[PDB]
Paper text:
The genomes of Bacteroidales contain genes encoding glycan-degrading apparatuses that typically co-localize in discrete clusters known as polysaccharide utilization loci (PULs). B. thetaiotaomicron contains almost 300 different GHs belonging to 60 different GH families, and secretes at least six mannosyl-glycoprotein endo-β-N-acetylglucosaminidases (ENGases, endoglycosidase hereafter) that hydrolyze the chitobiose core of asparagine-linked, or N-linked, glycans (EC 3.2.1.96). Here, we discover an ENGase from the GH18 family in B. thetaiotaomicron, BT1285, encoded in a distinct PUL with its own repertoire of proteins for catabolism of the same HM N-glycan substrate as that of BT3987. Altogether, our data suggest that human gut microbes employ evolutionary strategies to express distinct ENGases in order to optimally metabolize the same N-glycan substrate in the gastroinstestinal tract.
BT1285 displays the typical (β/α)8-barrel catalytic domain found in other GH18 family members. BT1285 is a 30 kDa enzyme composed of a single GH18 catalytic domain with a TIM barrel fold typical of ENGases, while BT3987 contains an additional β-sandwich domain in the N-terminal region (DUF1735). BT1285 and BT3987 share less than 30% sequence identity and populate distinct clusters in our SSN data, accompanied by an RMSD of 2.4 Å between both ENGases, indicative of structural divergence and suggestive of the functional differences that we observe here. The main structural differences between BT1285 and BT3987 involve the length of the β-strands of the TIM barrel (particularly the β2 strand) and the presence of longer flexible loops in BT1285, with higher B-factor values around active site in BT1285 relative to those in BT3987, which decreased in the presence of the HM substrate. The overall architecture around the active site and substrate binding pocket exhibit an RMSD of 2.4 Å between these HM-processing ENGases. We identified two aromatic residues surrounding the catalytic residues that are interchanged between the two B. thetaiotaomicron HM-ENGases—Tyr315 in BT3987 is in the analogous position as Trp164 in BT1285, while Trp355 in BT3987 is in the analogous position as Tyr201 in BT1285. BT1285 exhibits significantly higher affinity and faster hydrolysis of poorly accessible HM N-glycans than does BT3987.
Residue numbers in the entry: 44 to 79, 80A, 81 to 201, 202A, 203 to 225, 226A, 227 to 306
The structure:
């Protein structure tokens, strides 16, 4: 069936809010991305950096991640550039393996269900790192695939993703990077069934009817996912119920839980 994939800006929003939405006695959301841990170049090293918000969530996996997983939601660690000049796309071979290993170790250590790649904000070329692509982004996907074959990889369709066609068998879903209007196409050779061509911004939300009509079109054309970006702690059930009607011939309800972020 169609998968609902939501990115939570964990600098702002407690991720438990994704579990407050119910459709058919199950969570409306199928995948939650904790957006985001960072790739950072530190000298010759490619490093995985968790900011204080991300690290807090990982340190509290049993109370901020596991409650979602216990409901059946798959929780992914988002991966994002962070202004160092090193990103997913300009690593050498050693750096690629180093970063793949750091990511796999975090997925294992924190009991996560996989990762999402958003090749954004790396600022390619700073600090003496290569200004252009080395082809590492495909090699990074392959390396993670081999390390965690049973875990999910999603790709937010931004940055050097045009390079990923050859490794797209290792990517579960790609997600359109612009909001509130479909683009009836996919990135990096993905089939309809592995792509979200429509991504709703849940902060600057469209009308429920807009979501209902577009999500009905997504379903009719056989796409495999709908994207959601920036779920907040307000009750946005009207929009999700629109999708429940349009794409799932169902309804979405809210359990009342607005979880604050006080860490
Ligand atoms: Mg509105």
């Amino acid at each position: 069936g169609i998968k609902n994939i939501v990115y939570i800006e964990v600098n702002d929003i407690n991720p438990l809010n994704a579990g407050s939405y119910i459709m058919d006695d199950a969570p409306f959301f199928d995948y939650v991305i904790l957006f985001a841990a960072n790739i950072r170049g530190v000298g010759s090293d490619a490093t995985l950096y968790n900011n204080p918000n991300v690290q807090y969530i990982l340190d509290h996996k049993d109370t901020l991640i596991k409650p979602l997983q216990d409901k059946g939601i798959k929780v992914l660690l988002g991966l994002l550039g962070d202004h160092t000049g090193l990103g997913f796309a300009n690593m050498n071979s050693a750096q690629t393996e180093q970063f793949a290993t750091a990511v796999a170790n975090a997925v294992s250590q924190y009991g996560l269900d996989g990762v999402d790649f958003d090749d954004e904000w790396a600022e390619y070329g700073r600090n003496g790192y290569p200004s252009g692509s080395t082809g590492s982004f495909s090699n990074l996907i392959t390396a993670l695939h081999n390390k965690m074959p049973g875990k999910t990889i999603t790709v937010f369709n931004y940055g050097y993703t045009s390079e990923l066609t050859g490794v797209n068998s290792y990517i579960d879903y790609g997600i359109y990077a612009f909001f509130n209007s479909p683009s009836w196409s996919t990135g990096f050779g993905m089939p309809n069934s592995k792509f979200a061509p429509y991504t709703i911004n849940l902060n600057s939300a469209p009308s429920a009817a807009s979501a209902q009509l577009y999500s009905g079109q997504v379903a009719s054309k056989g796409y495999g996912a709908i994207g959601y970006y920036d779920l907040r702690a307000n009750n946005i059930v009207s929009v999700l119920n629109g999708v429940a009607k349009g794409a799932f011939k169902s309804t979405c309800t809210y359990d009342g839980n607005s979880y604050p972020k006080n860490y």
